[PDB]
Amino acid sequence: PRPTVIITGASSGVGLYATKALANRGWHVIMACRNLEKAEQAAKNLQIPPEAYTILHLDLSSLASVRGFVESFRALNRPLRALVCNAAVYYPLLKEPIYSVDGYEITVATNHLGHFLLINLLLEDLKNSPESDKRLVILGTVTAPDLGNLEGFEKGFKKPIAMINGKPFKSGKAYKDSKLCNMLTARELHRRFHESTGIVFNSLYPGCVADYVSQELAGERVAMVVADPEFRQSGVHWSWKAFVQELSAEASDEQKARRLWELSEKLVGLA
Numbered sequence: 001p002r003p004t005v006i007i008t009g010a011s012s013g014v015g016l017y018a019t020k021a022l023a024n025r026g027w028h029v030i031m032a033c034r035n036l037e038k039a040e041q042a043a044k045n046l047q048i049p050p051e052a053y054t055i056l057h058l059d060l061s062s063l064a065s066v067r068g069f070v071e072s073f074r075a076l077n078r079p080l081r082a083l084v085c086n087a088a089v090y091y092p093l094l095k096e097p098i099y100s101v102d103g104y105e106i107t108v109a110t111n112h113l114g115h116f117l118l119i120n121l122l123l124e125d126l127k128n129s130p131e132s133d134k135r136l137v138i139l140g141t142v143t144a145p146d147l148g149n150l151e152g153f154e155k156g157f158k159k160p161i162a163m164i165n166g167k168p169f170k171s172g173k174a175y176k177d178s179k180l181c182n183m184l185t186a187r188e189l190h191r192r193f194h195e196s197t198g199i200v201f202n203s204l205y206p207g208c209v210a211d212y213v214s215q216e217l218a219g220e221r222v223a224m225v226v227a228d229p230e231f232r233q234s235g236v237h238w239s240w241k242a243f244v245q246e247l248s249a250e251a252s253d254e255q256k257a258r259r260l261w262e263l264s265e266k267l268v269g270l271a
């Protein structure tokens, strides 16, 4: 019946090669992508058997699209074994911010807020699934950049607010802030839900993937964290030969992780 894993941002890079690696291991991969034609071209391009994947539309920068993707996935009537939050956007050259359809600065909106809504919905599916070895894996970063007292979120994160700490827009820092949000979400997931659900919640940094380690190897590392018994440990950040990486003070701040969660629920319409 083939275990089922959802991978966001599966049409390129780490996510595409993770799709390849898990399809090779006998999994059925849901490629959750925003450009359906680029995704089908990429899967064919890597010679992934069509039995092993299903492409569904997901645009993380639109909260309505997130809910639409979840609807489409649930219509397949496939029990979920794992979720990989891999998609990310980075805009190195912007000097002024870009806002999502929902009104949110696009880097944080895509990399954190859209994933945050997706996680909260698909947690329901992981809980209900009868699989015994269920995992939610978040792609993190090397930096283990600062959210202040989350003033930008406390005020609702609408234009002209463009940074989580409410200070002036900086595009490179917006990216790092968004990856710190990913790390804090992985930590709060473990704290709140690991004992209650038995789901393994962790993160990983696969290495520096110019395009240094290859995209193919990075994808294989994602597959190990998803599938291999040696990585069945909740609440840890894996880094590379793999080791448990101690996190920064800000990423280990449990009050901040909880407050980020509460404010994020509000911003995505879950409160």
Ligand SMILES: NC(=O)c1ccc[n+]([C@@H]2O[C@H](COP(=O)([O-])OP(=O)(O)OC[C@H]3O[C@@H](n4cnc5c(N)ncnc54)[C@H](OP(=O)(O)O)[C@@H]3O)[C@@H](O)[C@H]2O)c1
Binding pocket: 008, 009, 010, 011, 012, 013, 014, 015, 032, 033, 034, 035, 038, 058, 059, 060, 061, 062, 085, 086, 087, 088, 089, 110, 139, 140, 141, 142, 179, 205, 206, 207, 208, 209, 210, 211
């Ligand atoms: N590259 C590195 O060295 C490195 C290092 C550490 C961590 N990471 C992390 O690894 C993960 C993947 O990175 P990558 O290097 O493989 O980058 P990538 O090749 O540019 O792939 C990013 C994927 O995310 C998707 N994406 C962007 N916006 C989206 C949206 N609104 N909705 C749905 N999907 C969206 C992209 O879709 P499109 O194909 O349509 O553009 C693309 O498939 C990220 O979380 C990144 O932070 C990367």
